[PDB]
């Protein structure tokens, strides 16, 4: 019947919903609970470079809020 | 005046893609001339901050150029914040 194709289509749906969820979770584990900043312009890249130089452990993702100041 | 209408309806029945393409072409030609929002696009592209507009020197001369950024003087954006 119509429910015969749906096992193979369901494991197709599982194995193609796994890379986007996996790359979002590995971006979260890469950047420590935060997401990876995107440098569309040069100002965002200088912003991320200044974020790395403010954090000082060669790390973009950890950041100094008002706990340092 | 029936020949142009018969040719238009015959091309509409047979090959309507060039009729739809020339109608959408003439609509795109004439619709900035009709619409009043043509003049708002240059207002949008002027009133976007895109670089730093630098401060100017003053000798107490001009009153239109403000000192506080929250002054009512200068080109405001009540036509963009509310509209």
């Amino acid at each position: 019947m119509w429910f015969e194709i749906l096992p193979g289509l369901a494991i197709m749906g599982v194995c193609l919903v796994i890379p986007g969820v996996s790359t979002a979770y590995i971006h979260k584990f890469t950047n420590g609970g935060k997401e990876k900043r995107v440098a569309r312009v040069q100002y965002q890249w200088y912003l991320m470079e200044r974020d790395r130089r403010i954090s000082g452990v060669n790390r973009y993702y950890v950041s100094k809020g008002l706990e340092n100041i | 005046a029936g020949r142009i209408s018969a040719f238009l309806k015959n091309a509409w029945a047979k090959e309507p893609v060039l009729v739809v393409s020339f109608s959408v072409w003439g609509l795109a030609i004439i619709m900035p001339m009709i619409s009043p929002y043509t003049k708002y696009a240059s207002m949008i592209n002027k009133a976007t901050p895109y670089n730093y507009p630098v401060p100017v020197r003053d000798d107490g001369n001009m009153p239109d150029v403000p000192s506080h950024p929250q002054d009512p003087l200068g080109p405001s954006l009540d036509w963009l914040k509310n509209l």
């Binding site: 019947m1 119509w2 | 509409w12 029945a13 047979k14 309507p16 893609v17 009729v19 739809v20």
Partner: protein, 53 residues
């Protein structure tokens, strides 16, 4: 406008899509031959054989 909506939306190709959409929701006509064998006849002539009294 009916002819100019038959063209430029290709609604008779949408009609053929609906025909194949009607045929995809059917329990199919195949049989699973090593476990579900074929329809035949009593007059179906096959392997030659010598009978006996």
């Amino acid at each position: 406008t009916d002819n100019a909506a038959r063209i430029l939306m290709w609604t008779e190709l949408i009609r053929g899509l609906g025909m194949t959409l009607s045929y995809l929701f059917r329990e199919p006509a195949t049989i699973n031959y090593p476990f579900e064998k074929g329809p035949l006849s009593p007059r179906f002539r096959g392997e030659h054989a010598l009978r006996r009294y």
